[PDB]
Amino acid sequence: SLLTEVETYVLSIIPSGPLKAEIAQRLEDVFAGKNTDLEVLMEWLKTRPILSPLTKGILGFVFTLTVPSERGLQRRRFVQNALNGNGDPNNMDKAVKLYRKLKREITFHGAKEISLSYSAGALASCMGLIYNRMGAVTTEVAFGLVCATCEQIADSQ
Amino acid sequence: MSLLTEVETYVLSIIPSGPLKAEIAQRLEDVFAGKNTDLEVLMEWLKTRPILSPLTKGILGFVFTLTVPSERGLQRRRFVQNALNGNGDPNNMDKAVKLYRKLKREITFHGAKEISLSYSAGALASCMGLIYNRMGAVTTEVAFGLVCATCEQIADSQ
Q: How far apart are CA B145 and CA A34, in angstroms?
């Protein structure tokens, strides 16, 4: 399935161990529609020791996209800080060019494919644009972007 | 002088004349004078204000968070993020990123305001959202020049 494919890309980013196990399970529960209190989920994520801030941002982004019940939770500073991109305009320029292209995609594969022509840095900031409501895209395309950025990160490790 | 009073005239210029414009001005003046106000309370008030356009509310939202003494760890507001997103348009965003680059090199309110006025309102609003959302950073006085150029452009449209 798609959600399973997303989970595999998402997990490739997490170092092996007990925490990776928990996240997988939370991912599966949210994907199966069992888990749903976003605020509780995001706070758990925020407080995880050892997890890279950037992996915290990616999972935070994934949870808010998949959870049905976002309710009225304001976007999280921890995720924003993790995905924003440091303030480099050159990197932001690339994130915007990617967004321009993703705006035309409607499939997971097409979305994932153009995202592969961008660096892990432009990709994370593009995720930030979307998480910040600066740009908007369909959940399937958002999924493709997420997977390309996870692959890039994991591939670099 | 008072840079802040200059900021205030620009900010006030986009609000329709009336009692609300009185409440808003009183608030600016107070935070400007240093009375630490509960930004959470201020933002809810703005958010729920009738007559004000969502754009106007986003600009004020941005101004208040920027000028309030303490943000008290408040999350960014959805009403502001939505108001300052340049309609999620890639060309607006493209120009906003270009403006941002130039603003990083500015150090004064007027230099910032002058370069900002050469950009369209959509691009200016998007740039403000970019700063609001911390996707970029500039000095305070340069940020004031950006929001003031925006107010000037919007006011002139009326």
A: 49
What residue spans of chain A are helical by DSSP H? 2-11, 18-31, 38-46, 53-66, 77-83, 89-102, 108-115, 120-131, 139-156
Identity of residue B55:
L
Q: Which CATH superfamily is domain A1-78 in?
A: Influenza matrix M1, N-terminal subdomain 1 (1.20.91.10)
| Both structure tokens of B93 | 């965003």
How close A130 comes to chain B (CA, Å)?
A: 9
Which of B135, B138, B142 is the mutation pick for testing A, counting most A CBs within 10 A?
B135
Least CB–CB distance from B93: residue in A74, A84, A135? A135
C-alpha–C-alpha distance, residues A67 and A33, integer Å: 8
Q: Which residues contact A112 (CB under 8 A, 6 or more apart)?
A: A143, A144, A145, A147, A148
CATH 1.20.91.10 residue ranges in chain B? 1-79
Domain with CATH 1.10.10.180 in chain A: 79-156
- Token pair in block for residue B32: 């400007």
Resolution of the deposited coordinates, in angstroms?
Answer: 2.1
Q: Which fold has domain B1-79?
A: Influenza Virus Matrix Protein; Chain A, domain 1 (1.20.91)
Tokens of A42: 């995001």
8 Å CB contact of A132 and B136: no
Fold for domain B80-157? Arc Repressor Mutant, subunit A (1.10.10)
Contact A92 B97 (CB under 8 A): yes
C-alpha pair distances (Å), B52 with each of A89, B46, B64: 32, 9, 15
Domain A79-156 has CATH 3.30.365.10: no
